[PDB]
Design an enzyme around this catalytic site. Structure first.
Site, short mmCIF file in Angstrom:
data_model
loop_
_atom_site.label_atom_id
_atom_site.label_comp_id
_atom_site.label_asym_id
_atom_site.label_seq_id
_atom_site.Cartn_x
_atom_site.Cartn_y
_atom_site.Cartn_z
N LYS A 82 0.94 -1.14 -0.02
CA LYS A 82 0.03 0.04 -0.01
C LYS A 82 0.95 1.19 -0.02
CE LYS A 82 -4.28 -1.49 -0.11
NZ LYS A 82 -5.05 -1.27 -1.34
N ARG A 118 -4.79 4.37 2.05
CA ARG A 118 -5.28 3.18 2.19
C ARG A 118 -5.79 2.33 0.88
NH1 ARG A 118 -8.79 6.56 4.54
NH2 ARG A 118 -11.15 6.18 3.79
N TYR A 119 -5.90 3.14 -0.06
CA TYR A 119 -6.41 2.33 -1.50
C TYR A 119 -5.60 2.07 -2.26
CZ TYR A 119 -11.18 3.93 0.28
OH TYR A 119 -12.20 4.05 1.26
N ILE A 120 -4.63 2.99 -2.72
CA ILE A 120 -3.71 2.96 -3.70
C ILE A 120 -2.46 2.18 -3.41
CG2 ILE A 120 -4.89 4.93 -4.85
CD1 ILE A 120 -2.78 6.53 -3.78
#
Lengths: 242, 227, 80, 81, 146
Positions: A14, A76-78
């Site tokens: 992450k 927290r996504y990419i």
DNA sequence: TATATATATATGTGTATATATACACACATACATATACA
DNA sequence: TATATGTATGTGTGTATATATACACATATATATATATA
């Protein structure tokens, strides 16, 4: 920290996990939000971004031209990944043993500088303030830089000793143009500076002008909101659609 | 006026107002008039609703039920660790009491004469060396006991072929023979621990109770800093 | 008010170094002072260097030993 | 993840660095803020705290009785081992 | 290039003791000796060079002065920590051809230290070519490197 | 004094959004302050 | 009555400094709100 982290396998991490890694092993002594923002903007790649040759491959939503790259995801996504063969060719591993390093708290962390195979300080963009000084660059053509370094190094190139004379006496021979890659407008040198031009398309049968290109590093929604605040121009247009 | 770990609150009353509290806030047997006045008691009301192994809710009525549900798991886990240790100790005795005879017979065997690992494994299979699985014996990570005696005798001679020339010396022989003696004494201790009353592994668990107790006492004295 | 002593400041450590065995740490207030110190050494294999980023990273015994000497470590600005 | 992280030598780390470790190696599929809050509250020790026997030793400012542990430092500052 | 030249000479020196130890350890019979001090004595009494094995095989951040300054002043760990897998005939053959490849590479290093205009002038042309085709292959795949 | 509402707080493990401040400088927008007058 | 002319604001980039907020879930407690009694 990215060369050290992704060594075993080039498995994705992450942004906040890789940021925790590079804050632990490279002895970073600052906050986490700024480090994660730096990782995000080091991974981005769109027409008009800062980096033309990024260190990382970005996996996820990393923003677009329109909001200037300010429309990415949360960390927290990419994900990021090491662009392994470009990092291998530009920054060779057997050269990094022979560099001056920075010590934090006793231990080695990172070099004083990398010495790339190409002059990467003039190959990308940038615009920062600082204390006392300003930084602003516009990237050069790749082919000009390749021709210059092959004129310096190769002895069978017919512009070898001419370029050595020019280095001795501080004159120029070979051109050095701005980078028009991934840009569809046009560049003109007037006097002592270059100008960049966007492209319109006009039709008086419908009173429509169609903008098909903006100048270099112009965000789209910032341009459209800037054209709506000038009431000298609003007295001539009715409706603007993206 | 409280410190960072000790309460000290100070109230101030309106003049001649100690008397009017007692008729207003009546004293029951369970709490005083001041403790009714200053909110100084609470009830310890429990909701013992847990989750169980293999998921799902479980709901107890007293703390004794939780203790009585906890005890057999620790009992069977002691029995499992002692049986696993017993299997591993037999297999390690078997492994090192062939390293010893290879060290004793390497000069008569003349390992340098042979061509590759195939001919070496063939000439080691003819002189009575057991085929072993070196990785499962050195590191039996998560292997159950049927996995541990099912793929152990199904290997090769890698245990004997990665011996360094450092350890063909006589002090190394003395070291290996005394550690084999310690392993078989440990094996006798393990197979004696698997029998005792009221269940196997009942003294080791008392020792661990005493160890946990002294670690808790040390932690409570050092303000949980363990200086 | 800068003339007449109104602006004051504390003075805290930035790096503490703990020797094995001894009961007093070495306190450095600037980073380059510690770097010039640590380059002079030959064996830093048993010292524990602690960087204190903000002042809320200071442990309980450290804040006790910093608050026993509070007025010892306040300074005052004089205007030139 | 804390048994595995402090295995070699028990040097302390920041709360966000340990949180990145335990979200990497233990396959934690959630956000990062609540993990750091749990790492903070899994190390507190004061009269009236939740855990009487905490897993971690906490190094820094980890809150007090007087706000119920709600006034700890940010994870940028404080440490655990 | 200076660092590579030094490390190649030192590794040639290191392996052209290990190969003759494999040739002579059948009758040297190191299994007969008591501990490693007697073994190091009898290895030094037959002409084996004392070497620093953990810095010949892995020069990390050693400059060339501290490379040729503290590496010939080690011990016999290079020769006493050999596995018995190494004593076979195919491993001898592989060490012989690896010595041949390091000798050829040392000849190439001394041949391209002396070139014109400056040392290492063709190597930097090759790295120019590799970086250029990696930039092309990254531009073709939208910087995803498929 | 009584029976009866409807809103209100706190705990752990989860789900989501944010904002001032420093630093340099080319550029954009807002007057406004005069100076001839008119 | 147009003109300049010197004022004042105003976002914007990278790398720093320090913070803020909505929601779910159960249950015990609470402090004031409310009928109708009269």
């Amino acid at each position: 920290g990215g060369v050290k982290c992704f060594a075993s396998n080039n498995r994705e991490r992450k942004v906040f996990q890789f940021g925790g890694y590079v804050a632990d092993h490279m002895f970073y002594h600052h906050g986490d939000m700024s480090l994660n923002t730096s990782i995000i903007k080091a991974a981005q790649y769109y027409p008009g971004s800062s980096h033309l040759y990024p260190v990382f491959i970005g996996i996820g939503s990393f923003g677009s031209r329109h909001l200037g790259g300010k429309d990415a995801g949360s960390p927290r996504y990419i994900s990021v990944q090491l662009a392994s063969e470009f990092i291998k060719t530009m920054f060779p591993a057997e050269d990094s043993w022979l560099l001056p390093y920075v010590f934090e708290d006793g231990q080695r962390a990172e070099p004083e500088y990398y010495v790339p195979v190409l002059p990467l300080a003039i190959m990308e963009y940038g615009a920062n303030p600082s204390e006392g000084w300003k930084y602003t660059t516009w990237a050069r053509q790749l082919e000009d830089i390749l021709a210059l370094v092959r004129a310096y190094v190769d002895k069978d190139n017919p512009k070898h000793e001419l370029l050595h004379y020019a280095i001795k006496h501080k004159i120029t021979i070979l051109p050095l143009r701005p980078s028009n890659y991934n840009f569809k407008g046009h560049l003109k040198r007037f006097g002592q500076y270059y100008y960049s031009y966007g492209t319109y398309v006009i039709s008086e049968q419908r009173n429509i002008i169609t903008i098909t290109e903006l100048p270099l590093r112009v965000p789209t929604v910032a341009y459209i909101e800037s054209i709506k605040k000038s009431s000298n121009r609003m007295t001539f247009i009715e409706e603007i659609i993206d | 006026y409280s410190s960072s770990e000790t309460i000290e609150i100070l109230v101030k009353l309106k003049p001649n107002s100690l008397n009017r509290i007692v008729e207003e806030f009546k004293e029951t047997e369970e709490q005083d008039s001041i403790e009714n006045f200053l909110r100084l008691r609470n009830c310890l009301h429990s909701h013992l609703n847990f989750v169980k192994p293999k998921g799902g809710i479980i709901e107890f009525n007293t703390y004794y039920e939780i203790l009585y549900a906890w005890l057999p798991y620790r009992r069977e886990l002691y029995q499992k660790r002692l049986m696993r240790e017993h299997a591993v100790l037999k297999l390690r005795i078997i492994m090192e009491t062939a390293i010893v005879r290879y060290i004793n017979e390497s000069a008569e065997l003349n390992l340098s004469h042979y061509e590759d690992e195939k001919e070496a494994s063939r000439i080691l299979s003819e002189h009575g060396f057991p085929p072993l699985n070196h990785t499962l014996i050195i590191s039996p990570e998560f292997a159950s006991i049927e996995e541990l005696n099912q793929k152990a005798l199904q290997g090769c001679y890698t245990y004997i072929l990665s011996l360094q020339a450092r350890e063909l010396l006589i002090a190394a022989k003395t070291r290996r023979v005394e550690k084999i003696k310690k392993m078989q004494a440990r094996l006798d201790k393990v197979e004696q621990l698997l029998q005792e009353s009221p269940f196997p592994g009942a003294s080791v668990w008392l020792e661990e109770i005493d160890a946990v107790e002294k670690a808790i006492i040390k932690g409570r004295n050092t303000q949980w800093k363990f200086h | 008010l800068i003339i007449h002593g109104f602006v004051k400041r504390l003075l805290t450590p930035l790096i503490r170094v703990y020797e094995k065995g001894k009961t007093m740490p070495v306190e450095f207030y600037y980073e380059q002072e510690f770097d010039a110190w640590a380059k002079k050494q030959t064996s830093l294999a048993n010292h524990t260097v602690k960087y204190y980023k903000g002042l809320a990273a200071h442990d309980t015994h450290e804040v006790k030993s910093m608050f026993k000497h509070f007025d010892n470590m306040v300074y005052t600005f004089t205007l030139d």
